[PDB]
A paper describes a structure:
Here, we show how peptide and protein targets can be reproducibly crystallised as “guests” in a host crystal under predefined conditions, and we explain the advantages and current limitations of the host lattice-display method. In order to apply this approach to biological macromolecules, we engineered a host lattice comprising auxiliary- and target-binding domains; Fig. 1B outlines the design strategy. The auxiliary domain defines the robust host lattice by providing the majority of crystal contacts, and thus also the crystallisation conditions. It serves as a scaffold for rigidly positioning the target-binding domain to immobilise guest molecules at well-defined positions.
Based on the previous findings we selected two different orientations, L1 from rotation 4 and L2 from rotation 9, and introduced additional crystal contacts by inter-molecular disulfide bridges. EngBF-DARPin construct L1 has a shorter shared helix, but the molecular packing only permits binding of small targets. To test if a single disulfide bridge stabilises the DARPin and allows target binding, we introduced mutations Lys1655 → Cys and Ser342* → Cys (*refers to a symmetry-related molecule) between the DARPin C-cap and the N-terminus of a symmetry-related EngBF domain. The Cys1655-Cys342* disulfide bridge confers sufficient rigidity to identify the DARPin domain.
Numbering used by the authors: 340 to 1680
Amino acid sequence: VASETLKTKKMEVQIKKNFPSVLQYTMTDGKVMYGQSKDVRTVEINGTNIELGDDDVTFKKVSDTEATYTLKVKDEAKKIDAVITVQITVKANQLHLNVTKIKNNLSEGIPEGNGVEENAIQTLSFPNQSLVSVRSSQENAQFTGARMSSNTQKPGDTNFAVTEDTNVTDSDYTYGFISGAGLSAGLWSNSEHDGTYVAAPVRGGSQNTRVYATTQQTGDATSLGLASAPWYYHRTVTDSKGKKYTVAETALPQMAVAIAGDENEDGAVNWQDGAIAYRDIMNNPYKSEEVPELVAWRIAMNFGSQAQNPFLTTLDNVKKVALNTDGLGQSVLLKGYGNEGHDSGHPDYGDIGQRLGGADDMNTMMEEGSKYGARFGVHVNASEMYPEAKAFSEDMVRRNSAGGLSYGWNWLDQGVGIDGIYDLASGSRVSRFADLSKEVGDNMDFIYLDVWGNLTSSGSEDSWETRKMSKMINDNGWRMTTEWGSGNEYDSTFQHWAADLTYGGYTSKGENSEVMRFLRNHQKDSWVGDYPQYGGAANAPLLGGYNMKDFEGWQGRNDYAAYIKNLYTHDVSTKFIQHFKVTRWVNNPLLTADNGNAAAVSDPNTNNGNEQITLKDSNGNVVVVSRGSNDTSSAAYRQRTITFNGVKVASGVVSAGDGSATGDESYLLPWMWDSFTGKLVKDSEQKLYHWNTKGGTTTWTLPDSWKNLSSVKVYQLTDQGKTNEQTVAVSGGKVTLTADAETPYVVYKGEAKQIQVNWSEGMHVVDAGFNGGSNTLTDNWTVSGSGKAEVEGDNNAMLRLTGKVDVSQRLTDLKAGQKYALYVGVDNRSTGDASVTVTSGGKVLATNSTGKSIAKNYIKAYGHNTNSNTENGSSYFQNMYVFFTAPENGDATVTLSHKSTDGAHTYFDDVRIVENQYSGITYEKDGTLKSLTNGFENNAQGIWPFVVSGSEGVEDNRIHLSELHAPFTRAGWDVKKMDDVLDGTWSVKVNGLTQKGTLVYQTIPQNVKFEAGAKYKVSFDYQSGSDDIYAIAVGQGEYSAGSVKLTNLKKALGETGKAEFELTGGVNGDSWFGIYSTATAPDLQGSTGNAQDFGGYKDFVLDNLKIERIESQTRTKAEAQDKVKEIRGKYDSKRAELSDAAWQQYQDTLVKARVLINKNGATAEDFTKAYDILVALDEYMKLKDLDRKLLEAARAGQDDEVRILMANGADVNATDIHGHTPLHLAAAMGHLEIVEVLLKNGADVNANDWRGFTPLHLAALNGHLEIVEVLLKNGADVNATDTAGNTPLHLAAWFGHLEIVEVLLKNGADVNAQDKFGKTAFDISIDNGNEDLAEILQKLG
Ligand SMILES: [Mn+2]
Ligand SMILES: [Mn+2]
Ligand SMILES: [Mn+2]
Ligand SMILES: [Mn+2]
């Protein structure tokens, strides 16, 4: 066989001239490794194997390190005619085989827009190429392979001896290493092939197998050789609509081997030796070099327009974690960074959440946080989208075989699957990442790709697709991170279901492979950590494993202390270990002869034959992690010792990662690296992290570079940073440390200076979140008053006020003459008012206040929800707003204050100053509300003036600000029957909250304040899917069922409806209105499946709210005096006959009104307010259900009972659930003996009900000739169009009566009137099926 030789200082490779093949590798020491010793010249194209002849291969030795081959690959029958150019290069102990050019003589290339390239070279391989091989005739001939396993009970590895009986053909592995005759080598390929896996719950590149092992006979022996799995070149793919595409290669085909001897000098030559060498040739995930620095992983969540975590709050929280960890690196995943929050706006990647502070605040957060070693990344979705998203198009939609939508999940809106192949082949996805790139430049660290591999985008989402997905992302300078534990083996540096050990159970975790973890532990957080509950891989892995907890809303996670406790429990040590590369791993108790690991490295001379891992860095430092015993029944199985350069730095049992049992582990870990590129720090910066689980006193040997010190400085780490400096003596290079249980300490060689932190940079105040300790109330905020101001809270610190106290601070960096919103979270337990006020040189620009807070916080992702115990096991925190214009003066100041000097507490947190164009609030001269309008077009956050109620308890509330994207968000697109937006770009949307029997959302006095005794006209535009599904609720104080007044609303589905009612301020000023979910079931109109959800039958949209004060009539001292006489006469003698709690509320109002009336020097305004309050008291004192019994009396036919209730004092225009007044309920039943008497008492004859009609329509429909004539006399609207369109003339002819038409037309009924349907007066009688009504219609009409 004509050959030639390639040379390096480490080896000489003999290569065949007739094909790109190796005969042998001969190391400097003479050890030889075989290649393909047999004449094998196979080239596979598009699945057809073609054997290449002598005339088909051209050879050129370029240099001593390189050869070029030109392969004439042809098959006329199978439409194959290509020219493959192969390069072979040698470098040190490595060999590379690259396909550098692929010329297709049957194609002019891919037509524009990734059209189908006919006879395209889709796949390429060299079957049984045997680039590297071992024979059964060689000393210790063995194979080690690795496949994907997300199951802690099932290893992904295999280890067996290569014996005469070894028979395999194209056996695929993610990794394969062969060893024998004192040399080991693994094969690397960039192949995107999907194959054999052990356990994986998803696709998304989990099944990437790039090595193919095959046996053949080499005379005497059986030879096992490794080849690369097939490569994809110009692959043809099909979208959900059947449209076919040809997409170019992700990269050209590449492969390599690295020949190793006894690399770890352990006297054995096995896969571990090849693995060490493999690192020099293997692909490395982009930005994997930074993984060891990411000590503090967490998610900062935003959801449902709430803006729970604006970008500049996230920066303050980075500073808090930096102080508590002494500056260890961080990785913050922004979940809901975009659009309205999490699972909103998918897949508009470039739409940075405007309510969070937009791209401007994101960049500030990223640039500034980077100074503290914090990395930032965003949660994106490439599988599901919502109609709101500007990317939503018919082409983007995934469709099924039937041609219908591939529906996603319904929550705030209905998600629709994205056609993944379209999104890739059209260039759509890559332009959306480009949109984000434009916003973030080079500031953002990573992308977090959710769900990829679950098969929502297509039934494929394979390694080829995943590779192209990771490329798009890496090309914009972003490190790849994803959801599923097994997902994206090639490019992911983090799996959420690997790092958050709680999800999915033991079958769905990180990578369970010794081979994979050996090779890449330092490059990823994608392994199995401690979660003993799962067993196997999760029972005290020696290398640790990232254990992720969160404190910023993700899944209601708000516990800061547990977050930090967990960092020091598992993640400091895990990260320390990641600064070293595994070089040896013996006695793995997971690997047995029974699970396919007979040949696994089992040394009885290291660690008593129990598990041990040795790791080293590029500087020759050695870490040794040892398991106390390989018996899971022994207490020692969970005992680990860690040594750094032969010195004990950690010992014990970690507290169980599943939170089941605390341990005893104590450590003194040398942290020698900066939190940036991880370069070594200087001696004055060299530090040790100390942790003692049980607490107590432990003695330790300091690292060698500390042996000559006489003392050390120890600081206890808090949210304030380095505290309680201790000087500890050093005797014989040893220290004694007393530590409290689960408490962090940092040890320095000398005195260390405090990390400089300037709280709330860019937030227009200093320390907006109250994280500066007790000290902020001295240094940043200014306290004045008799009362008490304290920074209370061991978790999320708040401001706690007691008595008369003013906490104030100057506003900075405001834009002169620009409109700003200033909101603060407030929880008021005091009856005395709690205020927010913006002033300029003594002038009050804006003020707002709250009495006792009347609504518990149900926002899951918010820091102070009712599950957070602010005081007495609850949280009533809700954002209180002020709107002002920044002064030209340039001198503005905020004041948080408490008015009454009672004992009760007021809680404030998160002072937010944000540019805002809202101007819908118009006041009176006295400062109270004249009117409020909201089109929801400028909401700083949330559904303001409404606040979310408890129909779903503490949840990621299915209520948010809906966005316009026509035609997709409008009624009529697909199965959609309701508009998301009624007016402008925004509305308040409720999704599927039917049959709750409780309040959905409501106004609160701190947003809308309804003055005791004052009348208001509440009006809004709305859309409700079904009749009686939602209701307007009218209450006083904290909501209690049976204490609220409901008005069930009519179906407005695709047509904006209108609602308006009169609200009278409750005697205690805690009156409000909102939306209530009734008990009646939706009218799904025969919808099946997701159609029930998307349709809108279960939904409620509200827009254009108008609240107007109705100016009352001016009263005299007299009118009011007389009203006290009247009110007391009716309810005095009835002393505790009804209630005792309601007697206190009655007596307190009579005192209030008397004060106003009798104040020496009172005025008409005092007299008319005392009278209006009294009128409202008389209404509260109608506790005996008279109003609900009067309506019950006109119904049944009780002509005698209406007489009793009316005179007694029941409401003249009392309404039921359908807005029927006593006139409506009696005009329809045919009771003239009830209507004649009710009309006399000034009962609203022109009052509109549920269907928008007056008792004219109800007296005409049921066939009452006596009630219609007496109604028109009393001033009934003959020309009255209802919400349904029908006037009293129309409905009179529909049932079957004529007589009414003549009595209506006489009074002035419009015959030319046309309803909403399109029917007129005469047109109705044609389809009636009778000419008995039509005859008198044609005579006059
Ligand atoms: Mn070795
Ligand atoms: Mn706070
Ligand atoms: Mn609007
Ligand atoms: Mn939405």
